């Protein structure tokens, strides 16, 4: 009852200086095929959450 | 009752300076295929909490 | 009741300079084929919490 | 009497697909720093003479 | 009395697919740095003379 | 009286499938330096003269 094909695909990522710093859940997906079926997502994130940086 | 069918793929990816740093879940992906079925995300992340950089 | 067929698969990741410093589940698949069935992710991760760089 | 300084040079050139098919002379040079003095060219260059193509 | 200074580079070139074929002095340069005094250039090129693809 | 000076230089190349085939004089430099002094080309190329390719 789920059929998926892929056929003949020519996929290609090219990067230089493409750095990543200090994220959450950073997923970069460039020149991708991506499928996804009936997906569910509760995430909890809480990143910077009190006294930060203050003077 | 589920067919994943790949045939006849080219992936790439081509990086010089793509360097990672404090990162929490990065999950670069690039020229890539995926097939995900029914996933269920119920993670908790809690990062920079509390007390931070102050003077 | 699950079949996955993967045939004619011609997979490539370069990579010069990306370095990976100080994370959590960083899980790099550049140019990569992946399949993943029914996951569940109940994870927590808590990595900077309490008093840090403070002066 | 002639002096050339470079300093502090960012260079890059990022490209996919960009192939080189019968050229002759084909000199791509993109994101380069090039400094040439006093050059001298007398080529010569013939392709593509007497008979071609025909029918 | 030539005097010629290269200080502190960062150069890059990053390519996929960038094939060559069938060229008479290709000369890819992409990211580089050149520096040429007083060049000279009496080059002779015949490619493709005569009778040639002809039914 | 020619004084070259390379202090702190960082060059890469990245290529995955840059194939070459058939070519004269091909000389890929991605991302390098190159510094030429008085040079003289008095080259001779004849690459695909007399009869080719006819029916």
Same mark, same amino acid.
Do not use: A, F, R
């Given at each position: 009852?789920? &059929?998926?094909?892929?056929?003949?695909?020519?996929? @290609? $990522?090219?990067?230089?200086?493409?750095?990543?710093?200090? $994220?959450?859940?950073?997923? +970069?997906?460039?020149? #991708?095929? &991506?499928?996804?079926? !009936? +997906?569910?997502?509760?995430? !909890?994130?809480? #990143?910077?959450?009190? @006294?930060?940086? $203050?003077?």
């Amino acid at each position: 009852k789920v &059929q998926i094909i892929n056929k003949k695909l020519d996929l @290609s $990522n090219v990067q230089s200086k493409c750095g990543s710093k200090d $994220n959450i859940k950073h997923v +970069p997906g460039g020149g #991708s095929v &991506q499928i996804v079926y !009936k +997906p569910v997502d509760l995430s !909890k994130v809480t #990143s910077k959450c009190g @006294s930060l940086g $203050n003077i």
